[PDB]
Short mmCIF file of C-alpha atoms and ligand atoms in Angstrom, two decimals:
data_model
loop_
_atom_site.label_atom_id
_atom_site.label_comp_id
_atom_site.label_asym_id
_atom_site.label_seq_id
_atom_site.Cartn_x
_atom_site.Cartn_y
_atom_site.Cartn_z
CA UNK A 1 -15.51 2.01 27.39
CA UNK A 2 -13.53 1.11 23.92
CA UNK A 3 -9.90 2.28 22.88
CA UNK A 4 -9.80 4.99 20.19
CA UNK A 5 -7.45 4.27 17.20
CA UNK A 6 -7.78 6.53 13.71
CA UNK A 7 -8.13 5.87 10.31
CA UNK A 8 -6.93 8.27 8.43
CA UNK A 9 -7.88 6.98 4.63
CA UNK A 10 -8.60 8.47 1.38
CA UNK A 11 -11.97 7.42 1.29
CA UNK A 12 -13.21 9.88 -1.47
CA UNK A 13 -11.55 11.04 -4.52
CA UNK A 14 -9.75 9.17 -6.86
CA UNK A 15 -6.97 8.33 -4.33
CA UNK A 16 -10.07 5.72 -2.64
CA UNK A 17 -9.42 3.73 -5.59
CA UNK A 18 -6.64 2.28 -3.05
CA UNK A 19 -8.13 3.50 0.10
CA UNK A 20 -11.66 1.95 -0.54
CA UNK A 21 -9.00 -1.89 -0.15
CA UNK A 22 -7.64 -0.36 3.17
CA UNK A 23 -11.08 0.48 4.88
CA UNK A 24 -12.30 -3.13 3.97
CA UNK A 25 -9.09 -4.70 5.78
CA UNK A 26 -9.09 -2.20 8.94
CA UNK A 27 -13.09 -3.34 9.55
CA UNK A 28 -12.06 -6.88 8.96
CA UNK A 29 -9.21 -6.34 11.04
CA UNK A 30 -12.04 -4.51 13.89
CA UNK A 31 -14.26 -7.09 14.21
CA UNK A 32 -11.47 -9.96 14.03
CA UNK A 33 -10.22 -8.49 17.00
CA UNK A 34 -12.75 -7.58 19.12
CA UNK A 35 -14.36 -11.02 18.90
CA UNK A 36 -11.00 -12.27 20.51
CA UNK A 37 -12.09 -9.59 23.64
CA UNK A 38 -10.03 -6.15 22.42
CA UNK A 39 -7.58 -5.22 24.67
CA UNK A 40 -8.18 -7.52 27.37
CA UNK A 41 -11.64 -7.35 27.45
CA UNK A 42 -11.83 -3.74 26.78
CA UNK A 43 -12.84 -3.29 22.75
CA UNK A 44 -11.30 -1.02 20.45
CA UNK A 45 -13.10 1.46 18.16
CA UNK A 46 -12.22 2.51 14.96
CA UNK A 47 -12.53 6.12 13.98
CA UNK A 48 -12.31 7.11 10.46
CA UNK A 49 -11.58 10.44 9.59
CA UNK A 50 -11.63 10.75 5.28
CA UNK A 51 -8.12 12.56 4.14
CA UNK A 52 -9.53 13.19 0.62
CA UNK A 53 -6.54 13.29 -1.68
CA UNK A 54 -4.25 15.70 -0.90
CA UNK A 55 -2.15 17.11 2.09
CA UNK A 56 -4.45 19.37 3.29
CA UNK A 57 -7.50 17.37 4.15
CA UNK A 58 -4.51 14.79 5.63
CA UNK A 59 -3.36 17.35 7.93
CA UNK A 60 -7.17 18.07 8.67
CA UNK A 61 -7.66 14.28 9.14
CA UNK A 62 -5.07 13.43 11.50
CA UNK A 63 -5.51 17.23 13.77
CA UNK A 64 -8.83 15.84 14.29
CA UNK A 65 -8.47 12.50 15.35
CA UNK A 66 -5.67 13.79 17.57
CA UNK A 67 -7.59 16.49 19.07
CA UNK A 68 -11.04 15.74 18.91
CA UNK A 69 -11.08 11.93 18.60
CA UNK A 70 -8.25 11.82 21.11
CA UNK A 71 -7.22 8.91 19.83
CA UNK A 72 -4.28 6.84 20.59
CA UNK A 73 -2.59 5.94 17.16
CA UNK A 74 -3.06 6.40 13.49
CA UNK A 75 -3.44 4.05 10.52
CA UNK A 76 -2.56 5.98 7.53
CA UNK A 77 -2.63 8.12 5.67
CA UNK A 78 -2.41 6.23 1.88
CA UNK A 79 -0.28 8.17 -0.02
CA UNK A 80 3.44 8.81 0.85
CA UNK A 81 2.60 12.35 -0.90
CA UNK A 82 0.15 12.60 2.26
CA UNK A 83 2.66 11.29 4.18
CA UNK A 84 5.51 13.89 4.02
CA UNK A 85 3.21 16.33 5.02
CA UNK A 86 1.28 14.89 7.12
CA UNK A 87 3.22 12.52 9.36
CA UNK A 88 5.05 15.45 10.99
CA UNK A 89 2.02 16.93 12.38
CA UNK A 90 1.79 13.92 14.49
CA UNK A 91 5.29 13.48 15.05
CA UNK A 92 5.24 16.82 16.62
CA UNK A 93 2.66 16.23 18.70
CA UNK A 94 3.99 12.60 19.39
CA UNK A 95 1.03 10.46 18.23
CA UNK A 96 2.20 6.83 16.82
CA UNK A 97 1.31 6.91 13.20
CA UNK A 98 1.28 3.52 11.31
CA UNK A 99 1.59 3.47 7.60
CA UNK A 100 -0.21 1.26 5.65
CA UNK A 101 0.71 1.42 1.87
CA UNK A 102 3.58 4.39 2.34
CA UNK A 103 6.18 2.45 0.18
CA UNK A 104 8.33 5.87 -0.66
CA UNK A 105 12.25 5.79 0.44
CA UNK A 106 11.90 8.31 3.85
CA UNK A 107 9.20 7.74 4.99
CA UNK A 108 9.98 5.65 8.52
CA UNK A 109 12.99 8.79 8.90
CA UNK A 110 9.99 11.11 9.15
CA UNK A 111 10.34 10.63 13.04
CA UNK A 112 10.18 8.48 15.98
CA UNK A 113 6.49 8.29 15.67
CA UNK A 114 6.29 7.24 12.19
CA UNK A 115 6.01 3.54 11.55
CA UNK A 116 5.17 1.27 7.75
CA UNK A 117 3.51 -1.88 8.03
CA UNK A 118 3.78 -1.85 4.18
CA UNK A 119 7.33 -2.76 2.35
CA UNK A 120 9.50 -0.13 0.45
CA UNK A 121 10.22 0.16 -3.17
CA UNK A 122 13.51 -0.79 -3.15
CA UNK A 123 12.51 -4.47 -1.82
CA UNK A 124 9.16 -5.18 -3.71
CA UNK A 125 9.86 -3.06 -7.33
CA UNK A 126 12.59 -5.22 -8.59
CA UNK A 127 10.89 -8.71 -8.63
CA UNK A 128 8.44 -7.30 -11.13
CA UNK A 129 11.26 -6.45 -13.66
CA UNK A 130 12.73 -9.75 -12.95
CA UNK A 131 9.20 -11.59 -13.64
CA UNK A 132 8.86 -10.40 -16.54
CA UNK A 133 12.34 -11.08 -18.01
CA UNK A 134 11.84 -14.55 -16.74
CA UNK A 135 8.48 -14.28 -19.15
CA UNK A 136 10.60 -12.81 -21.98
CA UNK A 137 14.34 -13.07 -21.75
CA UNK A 138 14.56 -11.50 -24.96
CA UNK A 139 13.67 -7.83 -23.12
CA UNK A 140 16.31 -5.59 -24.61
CA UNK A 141 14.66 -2.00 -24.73
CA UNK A 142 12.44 -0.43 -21.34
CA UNK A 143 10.13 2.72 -21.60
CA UNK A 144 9.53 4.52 -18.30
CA UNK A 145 6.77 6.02 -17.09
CA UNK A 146 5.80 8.37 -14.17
CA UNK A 147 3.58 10.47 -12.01
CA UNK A 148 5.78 13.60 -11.32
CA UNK A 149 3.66 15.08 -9.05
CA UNK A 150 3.07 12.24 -7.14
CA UNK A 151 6.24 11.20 -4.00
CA UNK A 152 5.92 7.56 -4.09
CA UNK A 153 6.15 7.55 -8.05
CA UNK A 154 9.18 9.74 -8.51
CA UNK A 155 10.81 7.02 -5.61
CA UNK A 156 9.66 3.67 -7.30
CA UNK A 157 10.47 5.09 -10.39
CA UNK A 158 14.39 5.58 -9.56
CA UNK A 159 14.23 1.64 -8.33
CA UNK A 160 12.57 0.65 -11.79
CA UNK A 161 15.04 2.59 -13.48
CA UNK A 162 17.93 1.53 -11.41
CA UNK A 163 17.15 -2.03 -12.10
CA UNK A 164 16.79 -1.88 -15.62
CA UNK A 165 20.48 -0.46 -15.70
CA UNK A 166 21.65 -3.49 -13.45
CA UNK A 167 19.63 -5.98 -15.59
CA UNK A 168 21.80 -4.71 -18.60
CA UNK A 169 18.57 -3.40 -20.34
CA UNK A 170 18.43 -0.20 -22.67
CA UNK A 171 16.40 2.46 -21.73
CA UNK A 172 15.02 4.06 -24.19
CA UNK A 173 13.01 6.96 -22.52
CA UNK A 174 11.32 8.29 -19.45
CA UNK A 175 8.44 9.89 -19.54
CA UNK A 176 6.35 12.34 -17.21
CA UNK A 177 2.44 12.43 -16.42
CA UNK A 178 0.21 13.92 -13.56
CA UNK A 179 -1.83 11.47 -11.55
CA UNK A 180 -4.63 13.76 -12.82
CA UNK A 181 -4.04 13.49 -16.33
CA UNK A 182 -6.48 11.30 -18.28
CA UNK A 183 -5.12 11.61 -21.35
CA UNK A 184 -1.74 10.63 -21.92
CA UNK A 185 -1.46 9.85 -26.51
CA UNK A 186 1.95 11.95 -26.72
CA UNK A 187 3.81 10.03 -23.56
CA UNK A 188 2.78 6.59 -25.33
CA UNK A 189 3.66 7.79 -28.85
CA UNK A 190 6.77 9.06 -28.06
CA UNK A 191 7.31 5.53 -25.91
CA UNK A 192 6.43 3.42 -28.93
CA UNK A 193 8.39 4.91 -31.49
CA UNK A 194 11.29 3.63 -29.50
CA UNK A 195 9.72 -0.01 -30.10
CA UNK A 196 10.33 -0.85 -26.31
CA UNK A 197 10.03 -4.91 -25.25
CA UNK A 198 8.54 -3.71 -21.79
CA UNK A 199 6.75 -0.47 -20.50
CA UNK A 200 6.77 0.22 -17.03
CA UNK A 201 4.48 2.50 -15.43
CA UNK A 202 4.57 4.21 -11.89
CA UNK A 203 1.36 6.20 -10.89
CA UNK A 204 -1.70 5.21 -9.01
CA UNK A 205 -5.03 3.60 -10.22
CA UNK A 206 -7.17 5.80 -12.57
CA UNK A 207 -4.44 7.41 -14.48
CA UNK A 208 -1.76 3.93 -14.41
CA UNK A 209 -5.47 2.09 -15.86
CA UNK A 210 -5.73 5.12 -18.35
CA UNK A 211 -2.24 4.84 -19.17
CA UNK A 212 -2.56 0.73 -20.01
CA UNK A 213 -5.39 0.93 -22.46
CA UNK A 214 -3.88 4.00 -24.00
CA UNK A 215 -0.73 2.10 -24.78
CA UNK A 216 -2.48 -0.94 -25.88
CA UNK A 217 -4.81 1.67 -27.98
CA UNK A 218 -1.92 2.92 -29.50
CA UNK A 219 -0.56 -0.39 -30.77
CA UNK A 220 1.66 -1.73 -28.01
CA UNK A 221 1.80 -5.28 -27.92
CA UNK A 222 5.29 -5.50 -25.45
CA UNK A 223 4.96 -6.73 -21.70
CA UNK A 224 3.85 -4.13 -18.99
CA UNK A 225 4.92 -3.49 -15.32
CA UNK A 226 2.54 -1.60 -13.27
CA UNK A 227 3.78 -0.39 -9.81
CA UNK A 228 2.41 -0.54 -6.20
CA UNK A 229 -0.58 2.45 -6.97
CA UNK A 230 -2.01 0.05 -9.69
CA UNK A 231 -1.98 -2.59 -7.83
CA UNK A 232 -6.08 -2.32 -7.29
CA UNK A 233 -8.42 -4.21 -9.26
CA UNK A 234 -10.03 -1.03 -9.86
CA UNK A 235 -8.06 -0.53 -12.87
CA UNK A 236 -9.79 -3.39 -14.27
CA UNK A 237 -12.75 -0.90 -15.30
CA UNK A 238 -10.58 1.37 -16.48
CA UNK A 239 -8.50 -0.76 -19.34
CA UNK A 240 -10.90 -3.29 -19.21
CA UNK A 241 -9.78 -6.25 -20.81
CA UNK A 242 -6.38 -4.30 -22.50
CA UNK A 243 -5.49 -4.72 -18.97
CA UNK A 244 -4.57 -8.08 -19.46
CA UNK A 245 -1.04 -9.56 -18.94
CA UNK A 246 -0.04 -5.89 -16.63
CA UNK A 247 2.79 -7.37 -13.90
CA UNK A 248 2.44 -5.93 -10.63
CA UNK A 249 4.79 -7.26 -7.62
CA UNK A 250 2.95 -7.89 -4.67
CA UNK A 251 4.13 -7.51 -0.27
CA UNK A 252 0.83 -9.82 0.39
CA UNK A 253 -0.18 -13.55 -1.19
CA UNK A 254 -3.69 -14.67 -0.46
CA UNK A 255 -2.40 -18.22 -0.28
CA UNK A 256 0.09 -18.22 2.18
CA UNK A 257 -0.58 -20.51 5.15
CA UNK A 258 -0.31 -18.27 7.93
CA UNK A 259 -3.33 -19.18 10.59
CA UNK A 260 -4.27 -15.64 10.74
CA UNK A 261 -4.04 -14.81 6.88
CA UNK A 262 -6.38 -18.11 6.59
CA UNK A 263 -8.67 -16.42 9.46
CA UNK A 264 -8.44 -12.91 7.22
CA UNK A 265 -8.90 -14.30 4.09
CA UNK A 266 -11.69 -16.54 4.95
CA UNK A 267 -13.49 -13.13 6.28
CA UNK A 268 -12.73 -11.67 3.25
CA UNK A 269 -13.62 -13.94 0.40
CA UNK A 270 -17.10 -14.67 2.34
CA UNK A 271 -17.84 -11.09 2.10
CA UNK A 272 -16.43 -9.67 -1.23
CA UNK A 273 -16.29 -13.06 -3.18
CA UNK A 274 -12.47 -12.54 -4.77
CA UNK A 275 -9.34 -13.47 -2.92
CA UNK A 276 -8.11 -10.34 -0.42
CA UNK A 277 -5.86 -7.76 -1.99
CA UNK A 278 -2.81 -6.72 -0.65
CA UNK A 279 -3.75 -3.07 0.70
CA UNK A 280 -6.60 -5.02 2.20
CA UNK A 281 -3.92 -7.38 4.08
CA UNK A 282 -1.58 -4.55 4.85
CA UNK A 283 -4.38 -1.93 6.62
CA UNK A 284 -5.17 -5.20 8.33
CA UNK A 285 -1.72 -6.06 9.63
CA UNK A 286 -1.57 -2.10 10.77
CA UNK A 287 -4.74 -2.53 12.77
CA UNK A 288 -2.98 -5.88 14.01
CA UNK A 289 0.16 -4.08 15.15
CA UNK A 290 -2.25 -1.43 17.30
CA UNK A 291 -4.59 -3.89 18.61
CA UNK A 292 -0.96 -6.60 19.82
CA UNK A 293 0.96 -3.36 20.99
CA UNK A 294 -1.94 -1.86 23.34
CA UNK A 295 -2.53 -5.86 24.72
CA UNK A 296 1.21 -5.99 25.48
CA UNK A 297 1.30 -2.86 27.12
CA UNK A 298 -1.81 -2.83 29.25
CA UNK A 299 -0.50 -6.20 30.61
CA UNK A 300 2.61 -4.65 31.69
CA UNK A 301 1.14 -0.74 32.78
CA UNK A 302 -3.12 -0.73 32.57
CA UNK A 303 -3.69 1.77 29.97
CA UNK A 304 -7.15 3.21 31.65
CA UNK A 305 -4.63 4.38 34.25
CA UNK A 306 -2.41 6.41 31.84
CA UNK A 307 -3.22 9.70 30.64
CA UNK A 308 -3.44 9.85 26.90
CA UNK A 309 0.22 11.57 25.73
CA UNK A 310 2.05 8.84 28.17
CA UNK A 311 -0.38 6.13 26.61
CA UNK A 312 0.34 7.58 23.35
CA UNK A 313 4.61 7.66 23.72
CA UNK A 314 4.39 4.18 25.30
CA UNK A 315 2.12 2.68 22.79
CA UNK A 316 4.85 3.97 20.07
CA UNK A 317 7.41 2.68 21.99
CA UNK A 318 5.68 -1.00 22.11
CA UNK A 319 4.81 -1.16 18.57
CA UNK A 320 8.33 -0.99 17.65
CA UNK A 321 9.30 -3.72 19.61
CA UNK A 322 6.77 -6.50 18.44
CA UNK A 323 6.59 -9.62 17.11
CA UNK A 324 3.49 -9.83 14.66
CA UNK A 325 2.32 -12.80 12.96
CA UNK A 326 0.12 -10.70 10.20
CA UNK A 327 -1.71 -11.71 7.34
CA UNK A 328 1.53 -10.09 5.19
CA UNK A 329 3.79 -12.86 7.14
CA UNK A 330 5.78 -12.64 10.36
CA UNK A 331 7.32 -8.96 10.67
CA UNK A 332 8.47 -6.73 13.03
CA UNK A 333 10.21 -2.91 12.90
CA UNK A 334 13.80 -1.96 12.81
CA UNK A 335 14.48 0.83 15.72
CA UNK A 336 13.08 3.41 13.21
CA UNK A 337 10.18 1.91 12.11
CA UNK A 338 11.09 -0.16 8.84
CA UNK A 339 9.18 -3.01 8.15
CA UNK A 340 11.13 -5.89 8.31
CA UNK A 341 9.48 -8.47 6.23
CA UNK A 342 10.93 -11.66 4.27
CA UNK A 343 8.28 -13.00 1.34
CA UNK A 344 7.31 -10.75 -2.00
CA UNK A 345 5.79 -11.94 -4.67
CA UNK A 346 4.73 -11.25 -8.67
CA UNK A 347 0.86 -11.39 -9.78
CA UNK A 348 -0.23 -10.70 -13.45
CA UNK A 349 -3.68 -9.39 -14.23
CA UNK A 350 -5.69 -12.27 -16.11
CA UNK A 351 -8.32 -10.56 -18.10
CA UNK A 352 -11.22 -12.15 -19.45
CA UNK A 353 -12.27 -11.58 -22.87
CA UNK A 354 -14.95 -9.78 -22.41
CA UNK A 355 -13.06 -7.23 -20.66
CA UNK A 356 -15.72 -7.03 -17.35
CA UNK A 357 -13.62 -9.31 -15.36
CA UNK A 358 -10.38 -10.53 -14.36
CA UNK A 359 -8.17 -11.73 -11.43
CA UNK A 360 -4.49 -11.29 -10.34
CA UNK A 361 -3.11 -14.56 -10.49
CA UNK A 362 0.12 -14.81 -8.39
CA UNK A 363 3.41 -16.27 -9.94
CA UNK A 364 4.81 -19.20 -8.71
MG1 LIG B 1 10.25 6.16 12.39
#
């Protein structure tokens, strides 16, 4: 006898550029805990169910783990896009849903079911502007960039923008893209005409890594901020070594001292030989939150007792309550399911030469 809990991860299509990091950490996170005994002894079991990348196969995703997985929370999905659409589905049928990298403003208000492990635009965007005017205090003129099909861009685009203004910075343009453009020469030409000292860019992974060596390409030689869906190292194929020098802020830092974060990133390094990225730590610390909330609740009402929608409100009613020592730092919810979390941090890609490797070395 194990305890169900879903994963509900883009684990094909481009979107598993960042969900390929969140299936790494939730195994971690699996096996971590079950070698400590589960749930008291009883083990939990992971079931993934793939979202693809868009709202339908999210909505297919979490219907099945709810119904035919019956399990007793979700991780996921990736995207806040997903997300909106998504989330209710559970909400409505009053399934705890745990959001691991779901960094759009709204997304805890979806409902009383709907917690984020992972921290909000508003707190982790503006460091990155500040990083690199720290680099350059000479920054006078920003160029904007954005997915504007894509929820979580159009939101950590307004915080970009909105600290630019409050950093007393020109703007000298914002333009539009689709995640699935490729090609993006008339954005970046109409960007560098306006000789901008910093670009920043809000998409995810394949087209923010298109969008980098494009600019570069083109002739840009300024400082670049790449939001929370570049913040993969596979983008590093994609601009290969014109991705050097991108800043991207960060909710997760390999070297802080936590016990646990030394136990996670021990795991990790031994397996994948690089330091763990943050959407690693993050699906992690949602698997953490489960795996804490069902102990703490079986202690207090034996969950093989309760039938699965009781187990299911309760368990959502625990999680919100906890104390969690993750790899991401201590954190806990507010009463609608915020993250409450204190340390962020700044990493810049360091490239190689050669362009086939490079590393994310944090800020200090
Ligand atoms: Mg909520």
């Amino acid at each position: 006898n194990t305890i169900p809990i879903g994963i509900a991860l883009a684990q094909t299509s481009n979107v598993a550029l960042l969900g390929q990091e969140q299936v790494a950490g939730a195994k971690i996170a699996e096996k971590y805990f079950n070698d400590k005994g589960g749930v008291n002894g009883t083990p939990i079991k992971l079931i993934f169910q793939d979202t693809a990348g868009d709202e339908a196969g999210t909505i297919n995703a979490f219907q099945t783990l709810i119904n035919k997985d019956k399990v007793v929370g979700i991780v996921g999905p990736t995207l806040s896009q997903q997300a909106f659409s998504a989330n209710p589905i559970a909400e409505r049928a009053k399934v705890p849903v745990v959001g691991p990298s779901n960094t759009a403003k709204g997304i805890p208000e979806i409902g009383d079911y709907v917690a984020r492990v992972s921290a909000p635009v508003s707190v982790v965007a503006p460091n990155s502007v500040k990083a690199a005017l720290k680099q350059n205090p000479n920054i006078k003129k920003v160029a904007v960039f954005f997915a504007q099909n894509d929820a979580f861009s159009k939101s950590e685009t307004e915080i970009f923008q909105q600290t630019v203004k409050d950093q007393g910075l020109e703007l000298v343009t914002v333009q539009k893209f689709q995640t699935t453009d490729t090609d993006f020469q008339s954005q970046a030409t109409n960007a560098i005409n306006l000789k901008p000292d910093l670009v920043i860019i809000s998409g995810l992974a394949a087209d923010g890594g298109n969008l980098v060596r494009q600019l570069r390409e083109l002739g840009y030689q300024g400082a670049i901020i790449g939001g929370n869906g570049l913040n993969t190292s596979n983008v590093f194929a994609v601009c290969k070594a014109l991705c050097d020098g991108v800043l991207i802020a960060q909710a997760y830092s390999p070297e802080y001292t936590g016990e646990i974060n030394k136990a996670f990133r021990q795991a990790y390094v031994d397996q994948y030989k690089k330091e763990p990225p943050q959407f690693s730590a993050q699906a992690f610390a949602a698997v953490q939150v489960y795996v804490e909330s069902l102990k703490a609740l079986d202690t207090k009402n034996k969950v093989s007792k309760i039938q699965l929608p009781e187990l299911r409100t309760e368990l959502n009613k625990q999680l919100l309550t906890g104390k969690y020592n993750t790899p991401l730092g201590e954190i806990s919810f507010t009463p609608i399911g915020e993250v409450v979390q204190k340390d962020f941090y700044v990493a810049q890609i360091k490239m190689e030469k050669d362009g086939s490797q490079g590393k994310f070395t944090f800020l200090k």
